[PDB]
Ligand binder design. Structure first.
Ligand SMILES: *[C@@H]1O[C@H](CO)[C@@H](O[C@@H]2O[C@H](CO)[C@@H](O[C@H]3O[C@H](CO)[C@@H](O)[C@H](O)[C@@H]3O)[C@H](O)[C@H]2NC(C)=O)[C@H](O)[C@H]1NC(C)=O
Ligand SMILES: *[C@@H]1O[C@H](CO)[C@@H](O[C@@H]2O[C@H](CO)[C@@H](O)[C@H](O)[C@H]2NC(C)=O)[C@H](O)[C@H]1NC(C)=O
Ligand SMILES: *[C@@H]1O[C@H](CO)[C@@H](O[C@@H]2O[C@H](CO)[C@@H](O)[C@H](O)[C@H]2NC(C)=O)[C@H](O)[C@H]1NC(C)=O
Lengths: 269, 123
């Protein structure tokens, strides 16, 4: 495979898709202010397991629209009525209860609530993810919910179709009652992030009752990541987890008994 | 590293190939919050001119710095310093080479041509 690699500025290229790359992507961000708009586009050989998608949300009077689309074969990236609640953490419309209506413009796109929450500290790290987002869209696995958390992250998605089906209060992790299961937490590589002494037991909350182990590659520059934590049923499948951790070619394992998912219970390679 | 300028905290999304972009201030525009929406006059050499001025002295329009033709020329939006320079995907008077006042390439007959632009300075 070879894909079209277009930088945001306009500058293109033809990329020889590297080992296990296998997908052409076109990602499009379109912003619409009052009567005013722009759009950015990147393109590249991407990880397989990706898939077409969309996200859109009001923040103030600004309306952001994400879309990304994928296709099988060479240089395919080369050419050219449902209501939901909307808000973001850009303008703190989510935390400050400024929720707005957002009519979806498509048949297939439904109400969404997404939580990206990183703990960490300060500088380099903690991706620029809005961390609370609500609006129309279609995303991996869909209608459904899934989540993960571990000692330092909480990801959650709620996908559904009914008028304002995504309303409700902002969904914070310590607002979700312990479920009784306890699973190892860690995240990095057997050297760092998930060495024996950084990996430890934690209290699963809310719907996340399965102990998770995911191994994959850390496609933002390699290193072959590992992740342990508390997953929902859903996240344990269809590589939904990759999107949270931006991982490629993940093998995930999900045991339903407390404290399985210990390191020495792993399958591997 | 987080690209933007002026105000403009930058934002990304895990779902969409972790693509990044800027949340912009009231008086600013552009991918990188670069374009200065308010400013009318120029500030000197007009090197640091950002505001959005399209036409030129004869009334003709500037070609976009990202246009196929302006990509032949010396100053275009594909070059490493394009951000720094003030060269975006637009047709705005710009003075990247430190000429007298800001200019832009303007299609005259069959060739792109520099043309001193509109926009009086403060004076
Ligand atoms: C994302 O959405 C795309 C569809 O909207 C899709 O591209 C589809 O890919 C096939 C080729 O594999 C194209 O097939 C074309 O060929 C058939 C006949 O065999 C015709 O019926 C079509 O008119 C068409 O010419 C599709 O055209 C093409 N559809 C589009 C809009 O580009 C991508 O593969 C999708 N990727 C994922 C993960 O869904
Ligand atoms: C488990 O998670 C918590 C954070 O919620 C971490 O505990 C804190 O540790 C930091 C820095 O080491 C302190 O500044 C905070 O005061 C602590 N906050 C709380 C609520 O305890 C802890 O470091 C975590 N362990 C790992 C490996 O991520
Ligand atoms: C474990 O992962 C870390 C990254 O988390 C790897 O780190 C690199 O170490 C080199 C020096 O040897 C530095 O120059 C890089 O900046 C580090 N990158 C990161 C991300 O830390 C580390 O090499 C990995 N080790 C193993 C055995 O996989």
């Amino acid at each position: 495979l070879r894909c079209m690699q277009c930088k945001t500025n306009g500058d293109c290229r033809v990329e020889e898709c590297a080992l296990g790359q296998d997908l052409c992507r076109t990602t499009i961000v379109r912003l619409w202010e009052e009567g005013e708009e722009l759009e950015l586009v990147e393109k590249s050989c991407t990880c397989s397991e990706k898939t077409n998608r969309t996200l859109s949300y009001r923040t103030g009077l600004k309306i952001t629209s994400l879309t990304e689309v994928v296709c099988g074969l060479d240089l395919c990236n080369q050419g050219n009525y449902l209501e939901c609640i909307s808000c973001g953490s850009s303008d703190m419309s989510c935390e400050r209860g400024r929720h707005q209506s957002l009519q979806c413009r498509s048949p297939e796109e439904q109400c969404l609530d997404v939580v990206t929450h990183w703990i960490q500290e300060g500088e380099e790290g903690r991706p620029k993810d809005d961390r609370h987002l609500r609006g129309c869209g279609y995303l991996p696995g869909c209608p459904g919910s899934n989540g993960f958390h571990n000692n330092d992250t909480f990801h959650f998605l709620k996908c559904c179709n009914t008028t304002k089906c995504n309303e409700g209060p902002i969904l914070e992790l310590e607002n979700l009652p312990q479920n009784g299961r306890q699973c190892y937490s860690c995240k990095g590589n057997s050297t760092h992030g998930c060495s024996s002494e950084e990996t430890f037991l934690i209290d699963c909350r809310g719907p996340m009752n399965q102990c998770l182990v995911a191994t994959g590659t850390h496609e933002p520059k390699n290193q072959s990541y590992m992740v342990r934590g508390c997953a929902t049923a859903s996240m344990c499948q269809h590589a939904h987890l990759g999107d949270a951790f931006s991982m490629c070619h993940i093998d995930v394992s999900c045991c339903t008994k407390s404290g399985c998912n210990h390191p020495d219970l792993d399958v591997q390679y | 590293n987080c690209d933007c300028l002026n105000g403009g905290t930058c934002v990304s999304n895990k779902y969409f190939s972790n693509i990044h972009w800027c949340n912009c201030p009231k008086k600013f525009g552009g991918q990188h919050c670069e374009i200065d929406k308010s400013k009318t006059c120029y500030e000197g050499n007009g090197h640091f001119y950002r505001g959005k001025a399209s036409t030129d002295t004869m009334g003709r329009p500037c070609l976009p710095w990202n246009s196929a033709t302006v990509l032949q020329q010396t100053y275009h939006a594909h070059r490493s310093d394009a951000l720094q320079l003030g060269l975006g995907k637009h047709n705005y008077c710009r003075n990247p080479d430190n000429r007298r006042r800001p200019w832009c390439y303007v299609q005259v007959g069959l060739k792109p041509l520099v043309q001193e632009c509109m926009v009086h300075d403060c004076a």
